[PDB]
RNA sequence: AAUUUCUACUAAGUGUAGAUAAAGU
């Protein structure tokens, strides 16, 4: 939904870029309470910038570098590096990062 | 009496300052109410149409002139082709073609106003496209480039893209080979058989054998002639008629014999995810032309032994190294077998192997065209068949292609629908890139077997099929480039169109255009069909604004963020140039040459896509070396705000130094000044493995003045000083590339980051040059190698050298006073203009290009360099090695092992100068997966483990008695790592020390770890400082050479320092 | 993460530092 990602934006917006988590990204909403791995579309990469859409103030996240232009709308933090994702972090394990 | 002060005002130079024009007043609605931006966009869209029409007329003219042409030199070519009496004749042939082109009575019009004005509005005769070709009436200049490119085909310079080259170098060869193949493959044919039906259905007038005659080549010059010839070759429906190749296939399937097949003659960006994906599905599906080519090449290369091995070939180049790697163990085995067989002929009974001998051997090799397969079989060993190994590796590549196909069944199935956009989807782009990568790896691999072409006994039974398949297979190059350039594409776009304002002669001088200025605002006034300042008769701001309100004027404001009122730092360079255009101190230095150009870029980002940093919210800072870790601005920060609106770019040319006076040769003046100078500095730059670039400034006697890494660029501003570690950014980007699904975008991001980095390093080196009056010392990139750990690769380093040449053509200090020497008005010109990546050699003004041989693995305090070959091969070689040392004993005082050698007793050690070295077991070395090893302890361990006393002395004889196979292996292993000077832990841990096994005159071994813990050090601090130090000392040797010669022989002094001279210098300079 | 444009930024708050030869093919 939108509230989880709004909280995630407010959290991740303040971490220094080298501390940002590894996340699973997509454009349709991702539900961590139900998000199950082993789907051949989930790739754990690291969040970059966290900006707002200028027209309706929806948070969007740049995966990797901003210069890569991989802007997504829904993320979910995970403990993973590649297609081998281990588990899904929570809204406080991301605050413990810094 | 400084050196640089003489290199101002040398020659002329040209640049285009790009700005942004802002419509002033009601100029934009006065433009939209005259629709001055739809005529020009329409013209920019009809440019491509008129280009295609001009191409069609050019093709008509070509097929016209290629009918009224008959050569007189072709029969001689065919008679002498089936090594130097032919190339003159073939260039005569190409000259004949080009003269037939440039000799027509209509060639004058092809590239001037007449071909748009009169010819093409008649050749067409269609009221739809005569509209196009009449719209560009008076706008002939819009084609100036096109014509200048559409005439390089009517020429004879024999580059890969020209009509003459196509017709002669690529077509006549195939025609002659076809004559051979028809003389050979005959009598499996009859007039009762398919020959007469061939003639009747495809030619109908004259015989089919006439197309394998010699002087009947002057019929396939026209594309329809190629078409009818290729028709009788392959088969042409009018009733599907079979061609000669499948008549041969029909014969070779009746009875079994690989009879050669004919060769056909030659013929002289995407915009939507669905188009890209359907192009992929079409060209690369499992029933396409390309997959069929792959299947044919698989059946061919798996039928690879029934072709005569003497007939196959392999081109000479990287292909040979790769083939040896895949067959004969590793990189250099074929080369060393050839070198053995070359020494057995061109080398006497003496060990006199000289660098001139080695260089002539290398040149003779590199000039060899290609290697047969029987030759590469002779170089092999017992029970190793080279064709079996080649067949198995090619079959492995084909099966890997099939596996990658099996991973991608879905992008070909009709059910497939795109979930995400292509640039944001990376599963499907991963699929596409994997497929293209496998297929293009196969394509680049089997490209070798086309071995130079020009050779006698090619097994045409094989090469027929090979070229038939490969000339269809090599379209993957264009497909790959197109798809990649589509994926690595920015979300915005910089597509613009020039605005003319109903005036062909517009802005081309200072026309209806002028540059006004008012206060600190500069304006571009375009007349149509307070007080200002004209560029200096004045005006009145009231009446000029009145003109702007009326419509008789189109005042734009020239603007970039330095003309802003909130800009306080240092202006851009081009901003300073522009502001100086109108200054008083500017006499003629920077002047306004040529005419400007007012372009127009439409908004590329939809305002529903604009993304923003909301105001009054703390933004994280991306620089880890920044004290301030957040930022809170009282306004918004839009990402790519420049591409979300329409923008009138303005290109203004300037000619720097239009009337030079200090005209001379730069190289010879540099040489004279370095001669007459008593202490010239030298800046050695080197590509390190732990450092992107490393600088070492060395005075005129070899004493290090400075030495530091260029990993981090330090920006000074407002007195504050902040640093940026580009090595860490590059490591982050490489890690991201390691994490990503596909790495087409990651690679482009890394390339552009490296380009920006070298744009910072350019300024670093310029401010180093104008501080010491120094002379740069750069690696000669033509000859040499950097062992794949060097971060800055060769492409970006070539771009760096080009950028440095292009900067030093006019060196400017932005902070300096303009009219002062070194300022924008009087910049230094201490380099000649860039010409080519191959002419970047041996000098360019203040830049000396230096070979990088023996620069990093050399002791900088004694000159020692490990010229031995300490690799274990057998018992006999290691026994001779151990018996070749003058003495090998255990020194008990120092608790070391002395290995007193003498490079005279060793092979390939002629470069050395102090031939008598005495090297110990001092220190510890890091072997490679890495492991630290204390050397003396390792020697004692090995000796005791194999039962050997060493306190005796001269244990060479006591040591060459070991019968064990592994003793000499271990011994040569740690003897090899003893002579290892550059030690470095692989896993990125910054320990890159450089120890030397010899002791200097004072009796202490050089160890970089004693100099890395210092500032103001006299010797290099690490291996990369050593590389830069030696690249600088080579230029110091060249400066000494200049000092040896006279003031007229300076221009001839060769400075390509040879290994003999370099080792002599490095070993006596101390 | 603002740019004539590029790169790295935020650099003291609508910008900072360096570089920049465009057009055409
Ligand atoms: Mg600035
Ligand atoms: Mg940027």
Numbering used by the authors:
A (entry chain C): 136 to 233
B (entry chain A): 1 to 82, 91 to 246, 250 to 279, 293 to 534, 542 to 560, 576 to 581, 682 to 1074, 1085 to 1226
Task: Please share excerpts from the published article on this structure.
Cas12a (formerly Cpf1) is an RNA-guided Class II type V-A CRISPR nuclease which cleaves DNA following recognition of a 20-nucleotide DNA sequence containing a protospacer-adjacent motif (PAM). Unlike Cas9, Cas12a directly catalyzes precursor crRNA (pre-crRNA) processing to generate a mature surveillance complex whose crRNA bears a hydroxyl on its 5’ terminus. Using single particle cryo-electron microscopy (cryo-EM), we find that AcrVA4 recognizes the conserved pre-crRNA processing nuclease of Cas12a and the specific chemistry of a mature crRNA bound within the enzyme. This specific association serves to position AcrVA4 proximal to highly conformationally dynamic domains that are locked by the inhibitor to cage the enzyme in a state incompatible with dsDNA binding.
From a subset of 156,979 particle images identified by three-dimensional classification, we reconstructed a three dimensional cryo-EM density map at 3.0 Å resolution (State I). With the exception of the PAM-interacting (PI) domain, which was disordered in our structure, we resolved most of the LbCas12a protein and crRNA to high-resolution. The map contained additional density not attributable to LbCas12a-crRNA that allowed for unambiguous de novo tracing and sequence register assignment of the C-terminal domain of AcrVA4 (residues 136–233). Residues 136–233 of AcrVA4 adopt a compact ɑ1β1-β5ɑ2 fold, defined here as the C-terminal binding domain (CBD), that forms an extensive interface with LbCas12a. The 1479 Å2 of buried surface area between AcrVA4 and LbCas12a accounts for 23.8% of the total solvent accessible surface area of the CBD. While the CBD of only a single copy of AcrVA4 was well resolved in State I, AcrVA4 exists as an obligate dimer in solution that binds directly to either one or two copies of the LbCas12a-crRNA complex. Examining the EM density of our 3.0 Å reconstruction revealed a smearing of poorly defined density adjacent to the CBD most likely attributable to a flexible protomer of AcrVA4 in the absence of another LbCas12a-crRNA protomer. The CBD of AcrVA4 is nestled on the surface of the LbCas12a-crRNA complex wedge (WED) domain and abutted against the recognition 1 (REC1), recognition 2 (REC2) and RuvC domains. AcrVA4 inserts a glutamate (VA4:E178) to interact with the 5’-hydroxyl of the processed crRNA and a conserved histidine (Cas12a:H759) within the WED domain. The interface between LbCas12a and the CBD of AcrVA4 extends beyond the conserved crRNA processing nuclease to include an elongated β3-β4 loop of AcrVA4 that sits deep in a solvent accessible pocket formed between the crRNA hairpin, REC2 and RuvC domains.
